[PDB]
């Protein structure tokens, strides 16, 4: 009945696609290797942390992110393929924002980075829209009852980024320091920035 279709080893099939196109000279020399480096080294959440840290320290920039995110990001030259129209959503003491792409895995590559396996998993895609609080708690983030949870589903071309709340423990920390607190998960809206007392 529901038998899985016969297929060759996945690697064999991945390289067969490559070898086919390459044999016809449809793929530029160094093209594939070039992109790999971009994905691994260039697209990094560190760029997102940078924007957040600055937004905490400089109120003028904060307003730029919240009003014209694309401009603010362009100002750093952190624009890219899956991140041409950026909108930053901020977390107030009574609001928590989370991002999802139920239909696929659309994320702001240049600022957050390539989507992690769990972000593109059937369970996250299906559950977070209906039961955010349950999903977050299981992940390790407990959101109080008086805090409204807003889930943004990346359907069109808009790519989101979350502007977390500034942890009270940082009395006059430097931008450099604040940068280490803002982790990838904070940018996706799944985690809350905490002061590493280790």
């Amino acid at each position: 009945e529901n038998a899985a279709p016969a297929q060759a080893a996945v690697s064999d099939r991945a390289w067969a696609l490559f070898r086919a196109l390459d044999g016809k000279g449809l793929v530029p020399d160094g093209y594939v290797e070039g992109w790999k480096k971009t994905f691994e080294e260039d697209f990094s959440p560190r760029r997102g942390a940078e924007l957040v840290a600055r937004a905490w320290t400089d109120p003028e920039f904060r307003q730029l992110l919240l009003t014209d995110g694309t401009a603010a990001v362009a100002q750093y030259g952190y624009l890219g393929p899956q991140g041409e129209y950026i909108v930053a959503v901020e977390d107030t003491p009574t609001l928590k924002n989370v991002i999802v792409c139920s239909l696929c895995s659309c994320t702001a590559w240049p600022i957050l980075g390539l989507p992690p396996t769990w972000y593109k998993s059937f369970e996250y895609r299906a559950r977070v829209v209906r039961e955010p609080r349950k999903v977050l708690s299981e992940m390790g983030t407990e959101i109080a009852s008086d805090i409204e949870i807003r889930v943004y589903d990346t359907t069109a071309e808009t790519r989101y980024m979350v502007l977390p709340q500034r942890p009270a423990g940082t009395e006059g920390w430097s931008q450099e320091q604040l940068q280490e607190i803002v982790t990838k998960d904070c940018l996706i809206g799944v985690a809350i920035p905490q002061v590493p007392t280790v």
Binding site: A8, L21, F39, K120, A126, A156, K184
Partner: protein, 212 residues
């Protein structure tokens, strides 16, 4: 297309395999993983054979069971290959002989497409709007949980993009439309069966209609 890809809302899944700030490991857990993305841009940008919208649709066009059993990156290897074959760039025979084995692609579309609408109703921020209650067999960018639901607009996009119902098929009727950020109250979408406050969906102008 009301296919398995439209997971939002589906009940039965276990828990998300992740603890906040846990180590996700390398960006690519396998050597072949960077290929699907790269070869996609090679077709979109370099060759100009298809659009990103067409890549999404080919994955959606996967046989349901095939979709569920296949991992993320492998879904795109199969998709890009299917497009390559449908555009006439490659031949399934080559793929198979080069792979050394079977290479099942996605199923052929059963919908020509949907041109962009000519009824240009421009909405403003703060307006209540209802999502058109319509069923499109082909590509579309509206999650099933929106049909007939009413929400409020919180942002209209300054830029315009091509209608995905058309361009996702390779039609020229694409046009250009701005997208809106329609905020829906959780209660409106899932009734009492909701653990949250509100969901914000980014919908194309052609999907909405004034609520009155």
């Amino acid at each position: 297309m009301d296919g398995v890809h439209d997971l939002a809302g589906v009940q039965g899944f276990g828990k998300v395999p992740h603890t906040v700030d846990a180590d996700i490991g390398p960006t690519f857990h396998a050597e072949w993983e960077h290929l699907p993305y790269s070869l996609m841009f090679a077709g979109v940008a370099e060759l100009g054979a298809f659009s990103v919208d067409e890549v999404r649709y080919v994955v959606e066009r996967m046989e349901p069971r095939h979709y569920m059993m296949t991992p993320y990156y492998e879904r795109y290897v199969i998709g890009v290959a299917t497009l390559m074959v449908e555009k006439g760039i490659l031949t399934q025979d080559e793929l198979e002989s080069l792979a050394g084995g079977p290479f099942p692609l996605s199923r052929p579309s059963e919908s020509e497409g949907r041109p962009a609408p000519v009824e240009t109703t421009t909405f403003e921020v703060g307006q209540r709007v209802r999502v058109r209650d319509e069923y499109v067999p082909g590509h579309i960018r509206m999650p099933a949980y929106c049909r007939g639901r009413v929400g409020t607009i919180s942002h209209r996009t300054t830029e315009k993009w091509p209608f995905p119902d058309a361009i996702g098929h390779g039609r020229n009727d694409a046009g250009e439309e701005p997208t809106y950020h329609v905020k829906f109250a959780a209660e409106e979408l899932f009734g009492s069966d909701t653990d949250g406050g509100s969901v914000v969906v980014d919908l194309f102008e052609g999907y909405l209609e004034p609520a009155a």
